[PDB]
Amino acid sequence: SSQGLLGYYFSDLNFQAPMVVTSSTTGDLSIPSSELENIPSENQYFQSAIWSGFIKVKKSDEYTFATSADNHVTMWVDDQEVINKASNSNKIRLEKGRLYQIKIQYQRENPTEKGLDFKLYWTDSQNKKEVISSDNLQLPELKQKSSNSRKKRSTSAGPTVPDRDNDGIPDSLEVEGYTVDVKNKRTFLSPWISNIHEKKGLTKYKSSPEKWSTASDPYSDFEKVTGRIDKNVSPEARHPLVAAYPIVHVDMENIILSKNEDQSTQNTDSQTRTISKNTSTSRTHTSAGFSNSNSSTVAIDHSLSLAGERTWAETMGLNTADTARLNANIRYVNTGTAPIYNVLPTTSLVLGKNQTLATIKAKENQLSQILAPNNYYPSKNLAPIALNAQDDFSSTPITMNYNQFLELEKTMQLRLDTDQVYGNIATYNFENGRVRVDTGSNWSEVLPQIQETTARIIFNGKDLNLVERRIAAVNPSDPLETTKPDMTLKEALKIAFGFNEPNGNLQYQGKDITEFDFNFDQQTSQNIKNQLAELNATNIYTVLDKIKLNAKMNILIRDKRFHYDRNNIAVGADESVVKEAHREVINSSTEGLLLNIDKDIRKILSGYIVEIEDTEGLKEVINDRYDMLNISSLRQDGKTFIDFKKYNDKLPLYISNPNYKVNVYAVTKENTIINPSENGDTSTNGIKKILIFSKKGYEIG
Ligand SMILES: [Ca+2]
Ligand SMILES: [Ca+2]
């Protein structure tokens, strides 16, 4: 369906103004006027055309080639003229299982009909003539290298289509701007016209005529826009200016700690004394940063999960010479734009700033599924990976010594550093028109070039998680790079993140761009500052269309509502923001609160503190422990219930006097206490908390 001959249709007689670039499955190379909706009626007259590709014969014979316009045609087979402005009865021997280059040129001055009715025929020795079938035709080898059987360049005889990078799109089209128009059976590539295409809302593409892949990634500009590409590649990365490459980090879902057995203790019948905790993991970025690394930071839930208030050593019976080990459930996460097939990158589990506790590896070439973009390995419909799997004898115990154990208890955090080793790439093959994992193609050969020639934007508009995209961008100092189209900050956001302009105001999912901040690495900031000064602009938000991106820029764009830590994880928000987010009270009673809270807001809250304030201003805190804040839960209808009874010995609030108040406070992640105070205090005393509800007993009901 994606196979056949490649056709170039021109409105001039000398192959200079290409109007349509498309492919035909069979020897019918015709384009009826009905398919020329995206072309000015003036430009629907084709005075010249060129087709190229390959013919494969299934049975050796003497073949005579012909077209419907022999008098206007010159045709070459393997550099050999077989038709030249006249019908030829000349027969050529073709051998089964061999591939022959085809090149066909056509010229007709002042056509009276729009479009083109053109067919290519062959005749066998038995005198059977027919339009050359689809099984006998193949596309040209539009790659950076030849196949063993398919040469990547067409014959020198005759006119050479101008395709400096051999991606299939004519030089002039990549520079000037092109659109791709969907048909049922094929794709038309056509010059951009401002009046006709803008009204349609079609995408205007520009690419480098000297870069087979303009984003320096492993898919060609032509492959991208024609759909001759891995279906798992992200939609935005079908734009020639958006890089398609995997981005992987590890998500830890929960953890279990246990004392390591030792040679001195022959007793293995003791009661289980393990410590199990949920965890939350966020990919992180570490002014903006210029390093291309994959890391995530894990937050271990501090809420009490066991009876008593013992130390971990007390709970697990660890003496000072004992060691402990950790088992966790994880998934790999691809937040990039291309899938991973045969390799999962290697991960270090790190405690503190530099300690490494484990090296996490999967079996190469044994993956149970693809790791697709915006997806997980294993899929969320399947069980996660246990670091120590029950079906595997040889999982390395992830062991900590006593002091490391204490440090983990004291910090309640781990780090997962993941390398960028992603294995082989599924590429398109023009010989069979299918996508397959290619042993000859590897991500480690592409990533450095992608990193060197693109601008990086990291954006958290999607659920406050950091998502990185790379957009092809000029490097003034690199001549090859200069050819690529100017990339503006505005265009970048539209094509890479799906920002849209419904009212002429740039928005992401309904949020104006002004609801996000801009942060840059030191060099990018100085660059952007100079651009603004040159533009005489005081406000970046009003000149996004005029701010030009360059290769190696690093841009960080964050939701303004939130406070961010050094890892750019959202950890809090302004008091007024938090208070406003809690203004919609659906229901209140002595058992709790029912509210509609923004999903993003919920993300930065570690919990709630509930208190009764008597008439004299004194306060009874019902959930009086740092580790008892976890009293909120998300209902099925997306509403939040704050549970007064949970840490009130399962009893609703007793309010002695209707004039007393019930005050509820939110505690943000950055204000969360994770360990008892040095004084040993475990109360909520001193916890920075935000009042989000206060009603008297008689107001509550
Ligand atoms: Ca090209
Ligand atoms: Ca190109």
Separation of alpha carbons 387 and 328, rounded Å: 6
Please state, as a whole number, how many other Cβ atoms lie within 10 Å of the Cβ of residue 53: 26
Amino acid at 401: N
DSSP 602: H
Nearest to 114 by CA among 30, 179, 180: 30
Q: Which two tokens stand for residue 452?
A: 């060197």
> Which residues, other chains included, contact 74 with Cβ-Cβ below 8 Å and sequence gap of 6+?
81, 83, 84, 85, 104, 105, 158
Q: What is the 374 CA–ligand 2 centroid distance (Å)?
A: 27
Burial string for 486-525 (b: 16+ CB within 10 Å, else e) reads ebbbbbbbbbbbebeeeeeebbbeeeebeebebbbbeebb
Separation of alpha carbons 273 and 290, rounded Å: 45
Q: Which two tokens stand for residue 395?
A: 């999982």
Residue with tokens 């099984």: 135
Nearest to 138 by CA among 433, 340, 407: 433
**CA 306 to mean position of chain CA atoms:** 40
Q: Which ligand is nearest to the CA of 215?
A: 2
Separation of alpha carbons 341 and 435, rounded Å: 12
Separation of alpha carbons 44 and 116, rounded Å: 9
Taking CA atoms, 407 is separated from 402, 453, 566, in Å, by: 9, 42, 20
DSSP 12: S
> Which residues, other chains included, contact 177 with Cβ-Cβ below 8 Å and sequence gap of 6+?
191, 192, 204, 205, 206
Q: What is the 242 CA–ligand 2 centroid distance (Å)?
A: 13
Q: What is the 212 CA–ligand 1 centroid distance (Å)?
A: 7
Q: Which two tokens stand for residue 495?
A: 């094509």
Q: What is the 379 CA–ligand 2 centroid distance (Å)?
A: 35
**Residue 137 half-sphere exposure, CB side, CA atoms within 13 Å?**
27
Separation of alpha carbons 306 and 412, rounded Å: 16
Domains of the chain from N-terminus onward:
1-244 (3.90.182.10), 245-451 (2.60.120.240), 452-570 (3.10.20.110), 571-701 (2.60.40.810)
Burial string for 411-421 (b: 16+ CB within 10 Å, else e) reads ebbbbbbbebb
Q: Which ligand is nearest to the CA of 219?
A: 2
Q: What is the 431 CA–ligand 2 centroid distance (Å)?
A: 20
Q: Which two tokens stand for residue 223?
A: 């492959």
Q: Which ligand is nearest to the CA of 221?
A: 2
Give the torsion sign (CA, 673, 679, 684, 686): negative
Query: How, if at all, do strands 399-400 and 324-334 pair?
Result: antiparallel
Separation of alpha carbons 525 and 583, rounded Å: 38
**CA 580 to mean position of chain CA atoms:** 33
DSSP 371: B
List strand residue ranges (DSSP E) for 29-148, in order.
Answer: 48-56, 61-67, 73-77, 80-84, 92-94, 99-107, 120-123, 129-131, 137-138
Give the torsion sign (CA, 216, 219, 221, 224): negative
List strand residue ranges (DSSP E) for 473-591, in order.
Answer: 507-508, 511-512, 516-520, 554-559, 562-564, 570-573, 585-589
Could you tell me if 222 and 478 are in contact, meaning their C-beta atoms sit under 8 angstroms apart?
no
Give the torsion sign (CA, 430, 431, 436, 439): negative
Separation of alpha carbons 454 and 243, rounded Å: 8
Q: What is the 214 CA–ligand 2 centroid distance (Å)?
A: 6
Separation of alpha carbons 59 and 42, rounded Å: 44
Burial string for 336-360 (b: 16+ CB within 10 Å, else e) reads bbbbbbbbbbebbbbbeeeeebbeb
Residues of the binding site: 163, 165, 167, 169, 174, 208, 211, 221
Q: Which two tokens stand for residue 132?
A: 């050359």
Separation of alpha carbons 414 and 387, rounded Å: 14
DSSP letters, 165-211, are TSSSS-HHHHHH-EEEEE-SS-EEEEE--HHHHHHHTPPPB---TT-
Please state, as a whole number, how many other Cβ atoms lie within 10 Å of the Cβ of residue 127: 7
3-state secondary structure of 116: strand
Q: Which residues surround ligand 2, an ion (CB under 5 A)?
A: 165, 167, 207, 211, 221
Could you tell me if 664 and 695 are in contact, meaning their C-beta atoms sit under 8 angstroms apart?
no
> After which residues is the backbone of the chain broken at C–N > 2.5 Å?
286
Q: What is the 471 CA–ligand 2 centroid distance (Å)?
A: 15
Taking CA atoms, 540 is separated from 240, 419, 529, 533, 563, in Å, by: 26, 35, 9, 10, 22
Method: X-ray
Q: Which two tokens stand for residue 387?
A: 């670091």
Nearest to 85 by CA among 99, 95, 74, 98: 74
Q: Which two tokens stand for residue 366?
A: 């044994």
Q: Which ligand is nearest to the CA of 21?
A: 1
Amino acid at 641: F
Helices and strands, number each (H, E), in the chain: 12, 41
Separation of alpha carbons 173 and 601, rounded Å: 47
Residue with tokens 């390395």: 396
3-state secondary structure of 115: strand
Q: What is the 170 CA–ligand 1 centroid distance (Å)?
A: 5
Q: What is the 163 CA–ligand 1 centroid distance (Å)?
A: 4
Give the torsion sign (CA, 185, 191, 196, 202): positive
Q: What is the 50 CA–ligand 1 centroid distance (Å)?
A: 15
Q: What is the 175 CA–ligand 1 centroid distance (Å)?
A: 9
> Which residues, other chains included, contact 676 with Cβ-Cβ below 8 Å and sequence gap of 6+?
309, 626, 682
Q: What is the largest CA-CA distance in the chain?
A: 111
Residues of the binding site for Ca(2+): 163, 165, 167, 169, 174, 208, 211, 221
Q: Which two tokens stand for residue 617?
A: 């201003």
